[PDB]
Amino acid sequence: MRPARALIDLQALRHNYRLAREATGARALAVIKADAYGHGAVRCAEALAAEADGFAVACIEEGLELREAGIRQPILLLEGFFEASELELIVAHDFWCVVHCAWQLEAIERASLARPLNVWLKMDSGMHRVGFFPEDFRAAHERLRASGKVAKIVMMSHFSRADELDCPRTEEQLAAFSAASQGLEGEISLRNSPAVLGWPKVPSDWVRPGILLYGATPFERAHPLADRLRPVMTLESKVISVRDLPAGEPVGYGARYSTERRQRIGVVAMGYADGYPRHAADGTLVFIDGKPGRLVGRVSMDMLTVDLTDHPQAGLGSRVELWGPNVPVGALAAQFGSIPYQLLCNLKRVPRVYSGA
Amino acid sequence: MRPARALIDLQALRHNYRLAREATGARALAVIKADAYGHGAVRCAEALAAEADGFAVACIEEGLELREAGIRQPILLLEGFFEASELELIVAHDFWCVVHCAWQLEAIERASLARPLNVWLKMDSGMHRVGFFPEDFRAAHERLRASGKVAKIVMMSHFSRADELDCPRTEEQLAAFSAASQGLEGEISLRNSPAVLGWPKVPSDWVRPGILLYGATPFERAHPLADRLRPVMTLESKVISVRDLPAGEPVGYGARYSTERRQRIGVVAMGYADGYPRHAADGTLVFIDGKPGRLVGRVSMDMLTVDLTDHPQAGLGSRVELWGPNVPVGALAAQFGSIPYQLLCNLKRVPRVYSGA
Ligand SMILES: *Cc1c(COP(=O)(O)O)cnc(C)c1O
Ligand SMILES: *Cc1c(COP(=O)(O)O)cnc(C)c1O
Ligand SMILES: NCCCC[C@@H](N)C(=O)O
Ligand SMILES: NCCCC[C@@H](N)C(=O)O
């Protein structure tokens, strides 16, 4: 069969979750939306179940997936419900539910509920994605309280630029949040991975680490705490064909790359349909049999090419690391204006082989 | 549940397959590797089964998927086998098999085979991906013939730049192929979608249309025949939140976009984990309730934002077309240096709803 695969190190996952808790002194929801950012939500939840305060996902189906698999820890629906008809199963499966807008509030007020809802009331404190404006937040809170449909309320917001350590936007958003929620009782939840790792003045009773769990830094440069993260996914394959070429020969579609000299090229069983980025430029780092090398030629749907010229011992069957502990996925992604989040989420087709369960 | 979904129009698929056959007068393998470029290999094969000469996939597992579903038409493994241990099931499932390199040839020569193999001998005629060099092709052919392990041989190659209609690389590759295969008996197979649509002087007994099946042109400009293709996938969702903003307010992560004026923004239940590109720039075309609109703000993993200011009738629950028959997926992709192939292949999480079966 094809030698492509994605290794998922669950010990590394636990390590990274623990770092988040230790750094903050807060309860932490492991953010495992989008199939744990491509790593496998059920398997990652199972691995964290014994020690996690809870999980967070994008929608009720991701939530139900976890419940069907036997996850009993709290689960937060980060966007709430999309249809009011979801409410009976939200209550029955005991999902914690974000409320970010007026129509959701109204649906709760007129809904017939078997048990009260645990609501995470979301404020738009400056990212202008979802949530109530600061000036509308108090009234929303009082309406949840008055409804008799709501048990606890957690007050929440989310940062747009916490990955920019020299940008004060995070400070501004916190100030707006604190001013608009002042005097309201309940826990608060503000911090994502960059704020957990890099913004120690930001408060939170509940933190919400996503990308750090997977061992990719959200930051563009080294950081003493993010430096301690352990990459979870290794995307790897093998060389399936070798070719000797004279200089000036085009490699792959579009001839973006031509051989610079007489070279030996290896074809690898990996391509953009698997999630490896088509945008990866010539000179992109790869590891070949445990040594640094480069990608040359445009990535195809199923296949990619690497330079074997300075790797005389390498050839057919050599192992190639596309990303992992030697080839950081975030540095790769930022090369062409992406973030590690996207590449990890794009993982498809290849087997996922879990270790450390 | 979340309103995101991908519509797959199987009538459009059949239409596009038929165009390829009609334009060429050749037998056509429907290329449905990578889960039919994200559209669903089994469902697309089932839809084409009654009229298709055959299918082509990337590997034995994609082949087996089709056989398990009851597909009885020929199936070509475009990269052959990755391990010689695949040969017994290749023979038993009657897979046509590419042979592109010496180690595969050698494995066939020493393999014990229950039935002979139908081999597509692949030449590297200038793309320098897989296949035998022209000067090695004849000897490879004679070795297959002499082995007594091989029934038919189809002589094949593949073009690197046929999507560039003003580039003579396609002509050069054909010349090299014809010169090196001259006098050898058997059918030939050279044409992919751009060569089917745009290079009528190129011969082929078997054509291999992939991207045109899905109703996306491989070309950067209009073309009379590619213009007749019908988009197969519609990626759509709905507006899940609306927000009025003053001018100069940042929208989404990174604040790449700030409101230009007083605006109304809508949050859509679609993001890059679903396959919608994170690279999509502000001003990207979308269709909102059947009318042109634009994307503003950076796309998030699960959510994206659109400008509703000039859409006074639109709001909560409005339908948004991300790509499809009004919003061409190829034009979107080429905006930021991608191709339609990648975006379609990246489809994840959302339901696929087939019509026309
Ligand atoms: C995705 C998400 C997170 C996790 O974000 P990271 O930046 O990956 O840590 C936390 N909170 C919310 C509201 C999210 O949507
Ligand atoms: C993917 C593939 C095709 C189909 O290509 P399109 O450009 O999508 O038409 C045809 N032949 C080979 C060898 C392929 O790998
Ligand atoms: N068919 C065009 C799409 C990209 C590459 C593809 N030829 C592959 O088999 O990898
Ligand atoms: N969590 C960061 C990844 C991108 C966006 C994500 N916040 C969403 O819920 O869409």
What would you say this structure looks like, in words?
- The structure is a homodimer of 357-residue chains.
- The longest helix of chain A is centred in the N-terminal third of the chain and has 15 residues, at 10-24.
- Chain A contains eleven helices and 18 strands.
- Helix content of chain A is 27%, strand content 23%.
- Chain A starts with a strand and ends with a strand.
- In chain A, the strands form three sheets. In chain A, strands 1, 10, 13, 14, 15, 16, 17 and 18 form an eight-stranded mixed sheet that branches.
- Chain A is an alpha/beta fold and 357 residues long.
- In chain A, α5 links the parallel β4 (75-77) and β5.
- The first copy, chain A, folds into two domains: 1-9 and 217-357, Lyase, Ornithine Decarboxylase, Chain A, domain 1, CATH 2.40.37.10; 10-216, TIM Barrel, CATH 3.20.20.10.
- Chains A and B meet through α2, β10, β11 and α11 of A and α2, β10, β11 and α11 of B.
- Bound molecules: pyridoxal-5'-phosphate (2 copies) and D-lysine (DLY) (2 copies).
- One D-lysine sits between chains A (271, 300-303) and B (58, 78, 210, 341).
